[PDB]
């Protein structure tokens, strides 16, 4: 291998490369490695952790009160409570989720999400809610009896205080699902009990989430 | 998978500082010292401030040229003042000869010089967030065990040359291991080295008209 | 339902004064009235004990220190009370000022054993957003299901041993997400209690 001719691409500096270089301090023995607890080796394991969605993001509502969905008493049946698209990586309620931020450090992604809801009312307060999910094809349903014929989960928060709505698939390559919360029943309370509670939604990504083509963000 | 890992998330060497060897006009320095700083640009800062403790060695490349993109034969010296060595103070200074400060002698008209700085820190890993005071207001949260050194760059000359040399330091993070993930910074960066934000809070999520509109 | 932070019980660094159940007791700090207007509280990790009992003698009269903790929050709330807390332990919780003066006061970075009420809990007083605070070890306190939260925290730091009066490892934040509510004729201030129990503590460099 004594005679060589330089093929093209010489004297070039390609940033995204895994070349080698001489150590500027040979012999140096860096500080050894002790076991520090809590190492994360993948941003996927950070996405799969549930964080809050600013579902109440609205003009005027400031402070922590943007993370709360108001569920009150005099909201008649079949009325609409809240709705938010399933798009972790478009400006909306997902923009405050660990998934909604990491997905802005990449270009394409595809997987299954989940939206755990949590009721924060009195123990004596009972009722029922309808939580319906609409595939990307259709649009937001107009009535409660129009969303019951979908992929929903009726929620009796008096009995069970937290549910999960697993999104089947959400892929971003080139028109996104919608989740609506309908007042199934009324909001019934015994005497001497507050008549206005809150729902807290938490978003995440299931174990099938993937990311591709890392890129800078738009803050 | 394998593209969302922490080893790949910090790859793709980027510009960490544009230093300039001012040598003409009213700035007849002939040299310049650039304190090695990772959190120089907000884009890289916000990414590095995702973890608490991180351990990595770096490879530094210097893309130097004149101010009209021409690369003459002018010789350059890249001296790496280690963390705890006195820095030079003039074009002609004793520090430029100390054999403990490794130097790289390359010319403007040569492939950019590329060295590899090791993991230079007293503790086990770098600490971007250090709750506490060092030296057992202007000292809160300032860890001194994150200094990596200094890169002093001068044109090997005798008198003033009359040509400003712009250098673009490029750093690549290798062998990175991160610990204790943190929420990504939401507010702006009002000042460097501190987490100081501004009074007018900016909501993380954009505000729409009503809660029930898509 | 004890959230073992990062899945690591605090352990003794293999082979320093290793105290026992005399110091490994249950320090029950003062209670804090949780009101509707309440924003939150936070206590530093070893600073909350540097002036409380034996642990205040072993910390000040020494030079090196390492220990886990067993933070345990309870809310003596009624059944007609509603609300929700977010009890999270934040490793290397660094407080930030808020310029319209540039550096945090010392009372805000080492509040003592009383904690400092948040001035902007939406941003955790540290720039980072509260919505993502759940990435830290945490446990919800939802008055309709349970009013207890126990967090087991190991020793998280770069060096094996470190100072106890200068470097405060983490900070236990307690933030009400859903504010407290009640009809007329109830205890207008739900009390919040915090219990601490150093686990596998060590010390060195006497006096």
């Amino acid at each position, epitope marked *: 291998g004594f005679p060589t001719e330089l093929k093209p691409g010489t004297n070039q500096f390609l940033t995204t490369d895994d070349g080698t270089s001489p150590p500027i301090l040979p012999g140096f023995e860096p500080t050894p490695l002790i076991h520090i607890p809590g190492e994360f080796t993948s941003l996927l394991d950070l996405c799969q952790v549930e964080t809050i969605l600013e579902v109440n993001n*609205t*003009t*005027g*509502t*400031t*402070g*922590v*009160s943007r993370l*709360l969905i*108001p569920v*009150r008493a*005099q*909201n008649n049946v079949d009325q609409l409570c809240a709705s938010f698209q399933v798009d972790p990586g478009r400006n909306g309620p997902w923009q405050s989720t660990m998934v909604g931020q990491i997905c802005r450090y990449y270009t394409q992604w595809s997987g299954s999400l989940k939206v755990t809801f949590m009721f924060t009312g009195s123990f004596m307060a009972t009722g029922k809610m309808l939580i319906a999910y609409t595939p990307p094809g259709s649009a937001q349903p107009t009535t409660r009896e129009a969303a019951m014929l979908g992929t929903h989960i009726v929620w009796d928060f008096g009995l069970q205080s937290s549910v999960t709505l697993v999104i089947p698939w959400i892929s971003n390559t080139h028109a996104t699902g919608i989740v609506t919360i309908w007042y199934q029943t009324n909001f019934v309370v015994p005497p001497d009990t507050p008549t*206005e509670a*809150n729902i807290i939604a938490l978003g995440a990504a299931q174990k099938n989430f993937t990311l591709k083509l890392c890129k800078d963000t738009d803050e | 998978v394998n593209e969302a890992s922490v080893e790949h998330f910090y790859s793709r060497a980027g510009l960490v500082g544009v230093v300039e060897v001012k040598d003409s006009g009213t700035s007849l320095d002939g040299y310049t010292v650039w304190p090695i700083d990772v959190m120089g640009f907000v884009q890289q800062r916000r990414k590095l401030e995702l973890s608490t403790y991180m351990r990595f060695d770096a490879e530094f490349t210097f893309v130097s040229n004149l101010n009209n993109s021409t690369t003459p034969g002018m010789l350059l010296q890249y001296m790496y003042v280690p963390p705890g060595a006195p820095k030079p103070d003039s074009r002609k200074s004793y520090q430029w000869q100390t054999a403990t400060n490794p130097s790289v002698f390359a010319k403007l008209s040569d492939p950019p010089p590329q060295v590899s700085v090791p993991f230079m820190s007293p503790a086990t890993a770098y600490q971007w967030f250090y709750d506490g005071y060092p030296t057992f207001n202007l000292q809160y949260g300032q860890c001194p065990n994150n200094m990596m050194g200094h890169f002093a760059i001068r044109t090997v000359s005798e008198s003033t040359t009359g040509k400003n040399i712009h250098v673009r330091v490029y750093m690549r993070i290798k062998h990175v291991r991160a610990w204790v993930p943190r929420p990504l910074r939401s507010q702006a960066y009002m000042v460097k080295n501190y987490p100081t934000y501004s009074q007018t809070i900016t909501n993380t999520a954009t*505000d729409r*008209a*009503s*809660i029930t509109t898509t | 339902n004890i959230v073992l932070s990062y899945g690591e019980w605090p352990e003794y660094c293999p082979s320093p004064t290793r105290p026992d159940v005399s110091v490994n007791r249950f320090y029950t700090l003062s209670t804090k009235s949780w*009101k*509707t*207007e*309440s924003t939150g509280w936070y206590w530093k990790f070893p600073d909350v004990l540097n002036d409380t009992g034996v642990f205040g003698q072993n910390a000040q009269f020494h030079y090196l220190y390492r220990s886990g903790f067993c933070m345990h929050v309870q809310c003596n709330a009624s059944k007609f009370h509603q609300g929700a807390l977010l009890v999270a332990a934040i490793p290397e919780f660094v407080i930030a000022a808020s310029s319209p003066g540039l550096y945090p006061d010392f009372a805000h970075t080492n509040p003592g054993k009383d904690g400092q009420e948040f001035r902007d809990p939406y941003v955790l007083d540290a720039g980072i957003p509260l919505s993502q605070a759940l990435i830290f070890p945490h446990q919800w306190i939802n008055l309709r299901t349970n009013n207890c939260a126990t967090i087991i925290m190991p020793y998280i730091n770069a060096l094996p041993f470190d100072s106890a009066l200068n470097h405060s490892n983490f900070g236990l934040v307690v933030i009400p997400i*859903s*504010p*407290l*509510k*009640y*009809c*007329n*004729g*109830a205890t*207008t201030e739900v009390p919040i209690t915090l219990t601490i129990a150093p686990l596998n503590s060590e010390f060195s460099g006497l006096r």
Partner: antibody
Amino acid sequence: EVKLVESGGGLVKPGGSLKLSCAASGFAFSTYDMSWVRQTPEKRLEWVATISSGGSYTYYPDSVKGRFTISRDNARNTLYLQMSSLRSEDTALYYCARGGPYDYDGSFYTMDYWGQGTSV
Amino acid sequence: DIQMTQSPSSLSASLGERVSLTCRASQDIGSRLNWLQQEPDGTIKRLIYATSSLDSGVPKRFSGSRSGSYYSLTISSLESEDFVDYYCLQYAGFPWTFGGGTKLEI
């Protein structure tokens, strides 16, 4: 019912002090964030001052911003509002009602029930 | 302040007519605009909250609506006990300003 009643007003020389009471009952006056609204002689209701749900926070509009001093007894079920050195064009029927930018679970009772309004 | 103001300073309709009082906001105030009804001499009651929902006791003749920057209130058929003052209040702009008046006549 949310029974609020304002009282303690009347004439006063320009420059001095004249408090105002909004003692209310029939509802939990320990969780609601109240506020003060002024109805000038021109029949234009302008915001006067507010108070948090525990008497710790306060937003003062450009009307006083340093002159009026609101408070909250919260134990005798009363609401205070100072008129320190009131201006010349400051006569109004100072109403008091609920509603406040604090109390995160707000934006629902924003001046839901009102008082009666005492003149000055 | 956002300075949401009502256009009709004074209107007059019949006992079977359908009045339409507006309140044109300047900046983005969202769905945080209320309507406060004031007696000739008494206190000021509430009609609409969040621009759409009636209160717990208000009749069916009243109803709110939203249209861009033209938040408005429309009474069904203008029954008795209606020829009183009207106000529009928003709590988005932190100064919390008000409008003018819509004292109805006949």
